Amino acid sequence: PGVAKSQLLKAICKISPRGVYTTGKGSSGVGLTAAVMKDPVTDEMILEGGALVLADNGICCIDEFDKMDESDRTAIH
DNA sequence: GCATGCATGCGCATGCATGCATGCATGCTGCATGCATGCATGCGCATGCATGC
Ligand SMILES: Nc1ncnc2c1ncn2[C@@H]1O[C@H](COP(=O)(O)OP(=O)(O)O)[C@@H](O)[C@H]1O
Ligand SMILES: [Mg+2]
Numbered sequence: 001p002g003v004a005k006s007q008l009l010k011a012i013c014k015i016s017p018r019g020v021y022t023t024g025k026g027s028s029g030v031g032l033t034a035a036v037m038k039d040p041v042t043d044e045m046i047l048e049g050g051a052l053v054l055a056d057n058g059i060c061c062i063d064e065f066d067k068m069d070e071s072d073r074t075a076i077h
Numbered sequence: 078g079c080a081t082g083c084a085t086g087c088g089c090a091t092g093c094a095t096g097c098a099t100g101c102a103t104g105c106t107g108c109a110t111g112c113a114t115g116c117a118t119g120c121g122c123a124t125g126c127a128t129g130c
Contacts, residue, residue, distance in 0.1 A: 069124090070124095
């Protein structure tokens with residue numbers, strides 16, 4: 001504890017053009033991969049992207065890696 | 078001075094601008110029906126955690 005790892009993650013997420021900062025249990029399930037929603041404007045079925053889909057061609061920053069679910073860890077794998 | 082015809086009012090008859098109610102029918106309109114739609118609900122099942130042993 002207290003060696004400034006999280007500050008480094010915050011900094012590296014501020015320097016990258018595309019980069020997302022997420023914490024262990026606050027981003028679980030469809031908040032990582034994708035979700036099914038209906039588009040209000042075009043009346044079509046879309047897929048909403050999660051953190052991993054927002055950081056495509058970028059850097060993803062995950063904090064408290066040891067606390068995540070097994071399902072979330074499979075996706076990272 | 079007498080005889081005459083015209084213009085002046087009476088004394089009929091008819092038409093005519095105003096005005097208002099009634100029965101029938103027009104013309105709209107408020108009501109009842111049917112339906113599409115999208116959000117919420119009440120539910121049973123699968124996963125991840127906490128509490129023993
Ligand atoms: N080497 C360091 N240099 C500067 N600040 C540090 C250093 N180590 C820790 N800190 C400070 O101490 C705190 C550590 O918080 P954090 O980044 O969450 O540490 P950790 O990731 O280990 O939990 C922050 O305020 C950070 O600025
Ligand atoms: Mg930390």
